[PDB]
Design a protein around this ligand. Structure first.
Ligand SMILES: [Mg+2]
Lengths: 376, 376, 376
């Protein structure tokens, strides 16, 4: 059966019989007719809905945490994948791989109707980037989120607030290793690492970047991928954050992200070298400082540079202390938030120090990234 | 009539006759043929366009204010609802319910082709959440926006700048009670209430939150829904704003949002207890302070905490004044904007005070929320 | 051929034969049947996919710069235009018009399958707003982006970082004359002009706005389109930026946007009157100050007001210096970034001055706009 067909021009002045189907040969689509409307009602070609992703509640993430090691895709989720419509009319279990503490996972809706997680961010085991579509993901944290204000535990589990989907995600360039804070903005779960170029800013069990072990110099700002900044100036950390489409936190962002930590408590010991891992001779284990949202070492471990200025000022003269990128006049301090290991009861979700110029560097100052929450 | 049909695999190597229609039984969709392209041209299933919402001008809101109590949906608006395509090829009147001063309304496009407003945010009277689709809304304000710089009147009317649609809206968690300022960002029409958990941050005719009547403690930050913060510290107000996905305003945001108010004028009297209502013994009625954008009590009523730091500093020693969440060192002031009732000619769209630490509290300091503008 | 058809109600309880097609007369669409599913599988009408725009990589711009005067649309780009599906399965050359230094261009995907640039932002030469769809654009800069930290050249060329598409763009009200900085945020290529109302904030070869030649007063804030602000206060510049949905830069934004400029170098001479053009008696040509991202006169030409406060404070008394919009108490300085022509080695990507109150005005202080990066 071949249908009556013509060009778009020919259709413009054609009115088919009621419930007649013609073919627009310019478009290669069907045109439905009502016996009244000239040009009829052309139908959409599938390619035009490619990548469609529809949720029942667009103001929440597409997935529900159902247990420490389990999660589900929500009822009402419709997904375009490999030319097919794949949907879920009930909360449907996500098929899990073996989960390892401190690893990010990607969630795929597959063209066979399954939904599955995997550590591979291209395609899940047994599928291709064609048969499996990445719709979101999560972080499998080394410990629980804080239930109150005494930090969390060390039972590896899905951090519910790290659940993201393609329409409910960090505005950062990459969504991995972030958690949603009060539904308002995303925070890096872990402090900035030295190897942020290959690891991203937020990674479990890596060397923390500070004054003594400066982060790798940004390849977007003349770095080569091997060189590190010569110190831990605010300037350098802010630059690394920008590389990744993130910011250093505001005061309001810091207090929100760090809530849940054990207040007025510090790591103790002599150092905090590694993310998600006890400090050197620490009197408090790392988990003492997990926030409500799953931000690891949220306070009392390393100060973070903040994105705020004020407090004590530098000299009222042109001082060339910017790494050779100009001079500053009456430069106010750049905020430091959280406290560090040496700071006993001074540390906490609101610990703030405003007596260090942005050109300052030390072994107990690093950084944490934040970014905007995107709902699409 | 049953058409030739096969699986997706079978179609991959099949080329139908020109203007032949086959059925892909794996997809359950039509495949159009051109007698040349192997696999033909599969058509989109309706479920894949579910929630589609298309506007002629994506850089403006979907509705036009046509009068004090009337509004229209714009020509060129196409809406998916209950499986149907519903569209408007001309500016079409929105069917209104009875409107009450200081109430938010939701706009629904219904599957019978009508568009209507309602105070119910689930479904409008006579419809269900299935037959009626919420596409946006507005605030019916207690008075007009400022025509110049002398505030507004007390004639209840639609605030044109409070018009929002699902693709032109506050980034806040909930869009209600906000107004779009210079097309740049959204501002809470009303000052933060004590009962922001059940009312949202911006509600007409409610008790204002300040140092003496602190807001309810955020349920996202260990609050139970009954307890209030023990004082009106910047810390507490910033926290409440975050709860709702909002911020305290910047200096640039404040001057923009408050423009239109009567400058160098204060409420007078002894207090401002209630939003959108005269202050206690006020010498100026509330409407004296409506901004160009419809921000109520924009200036001269209560100071708002700002999201900016600087000015006079606290001691250069570790001071534990954060509500038990750490210590601050050389803590600069948190900005206060707008002036309050006692401040005569000092109040205005640029009134700014930088001599109060974020741990300060008083009966004339509250907060106003802002957030980013979202165009999708 | 007229098909069996009925209303949506009638379909709800109808199960057609496998691979039968019926017509829903309420919807005017086809319903496919499987001989099992009551109501069958209704297909999408084309109008519901109107404006669809699909890219292979949603995290990058839709176009590639292929040379100084050439560019391509990327493989995998699917575009809805004038009822047709138009797509590109390989990187496809964009048809160029004659290009002029310092001009913005719009990219259209046309219903004949072509993709072309044009200086007209409504429709390209030989097409209409119906037959041609605007999907993005770019800036054809007066010179190259900085390869290192010695600025750029004067060979007119496409600035690769100024490439934007409808789903990868500034959050600003208008996308023109902006460049994407480290993939993180957008910066105005040029300093704010006096005639920003008709030119936008960022335009080549126009009079720069400063203390002596204040910008036009914003029509969104009581301006008439002819009047200028009486001086170059921070207040006025911040206001102009808001008009356009932009901000003055943060410190972190400024250092990012200006990287690539010749550091510790100033324009010299006695003035910088015009964007993208040598200063008056300048010892360094304008191109000495082009950033890595193509920000023109990024440093050492005119200070920009920043969106940050701190440093030296005004008096601890209520000072009415806000242009008659209230009083300020202990007002900290508003940041100035970049240096200017007189400032020799003090200028650079990190040059910052914190000793000028927001009410200050001078011939060497202007502004540059930034905004958020939008990925949709
Ligand atoms: Mg500040």
């Amino acid at each position: 059966v071949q249908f009556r067909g013509g060009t778009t021009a020919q259709h413009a002045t054609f009115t088919g019989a009621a419930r007649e189907i013609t073919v627009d040969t310019d478009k290669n689509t069907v045109v439905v007719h009502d016996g009244a409307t000239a040009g009829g009602f052309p139908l959409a070609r599938h390619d035009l809905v490619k990548t469609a992703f529809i949720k029942a509640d667009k103001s929440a993430v597409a997935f529900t945490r159902t247990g420490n090691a389990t999660a589900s895709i929500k009822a009402g989720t419709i997904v375009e994948v490999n030319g097919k419509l794949v949907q879920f009319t009930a909360d449907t279990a996500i098929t899990m791989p073996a989960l390892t503490a401190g690893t990010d996972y990607a969630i795929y809706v597959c063209d066979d109707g399954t939904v599955r997680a995997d550590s591979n961010f291209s395609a899940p085991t047994g599928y291709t980037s064609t048969t499996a579509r990445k719709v979101g993901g999560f972080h499998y944290a080394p410990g629980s989120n804080a239930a109150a204000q005494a930090g969390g535990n060390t039972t590896a589990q899905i951090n519910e607030y790290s659940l993201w989907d393609i329409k409910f995600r960090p505005a950062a360039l990459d969504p991995r290793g972030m958690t949603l804070v009060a539904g308002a903005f995303w925070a890096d779960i872990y402090l900035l690492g030295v190897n942020h170029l290959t690891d991203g800013t937020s990674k479990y069990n890596v060397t923390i970047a500070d004054g003594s072990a400066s982060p790798k110099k940004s390849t977007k700002f003349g770095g080569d991928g091997s060189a590190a900044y010569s110190d831990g100036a605010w300037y350098n950390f802010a630059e690394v954050m920008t590389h990744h489409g993130k910011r250093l936190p505001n005061y309001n962002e810091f207090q929100a992200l760090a809530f849940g930590t054990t207040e007025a408590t510090s790591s103790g010991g002599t150092d905090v070298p590694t993310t998600g891992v006890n400090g050197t001779g620490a009197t408090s284990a790392w988990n003492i400082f997990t926030s409500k949202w799953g931000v690891v070492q949220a306070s009392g471990c390393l100060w973070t540079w903040g994105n705020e200025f004020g407090g004590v000022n530098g000299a009222s003269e042109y001082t060339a202390n910017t790494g050779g990128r100009g001079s500053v006049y009456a430069q106010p301090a750049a905020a430091l938030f959280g406290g560090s290991w040496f700071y006993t009861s001074y540390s906490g979700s609101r610990a703030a120090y405003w007596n260090a110029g942005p050109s300052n560097s030390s072994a107990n100052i690093g950084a944490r990234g934040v970014c905007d929450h995107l709902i699409l």
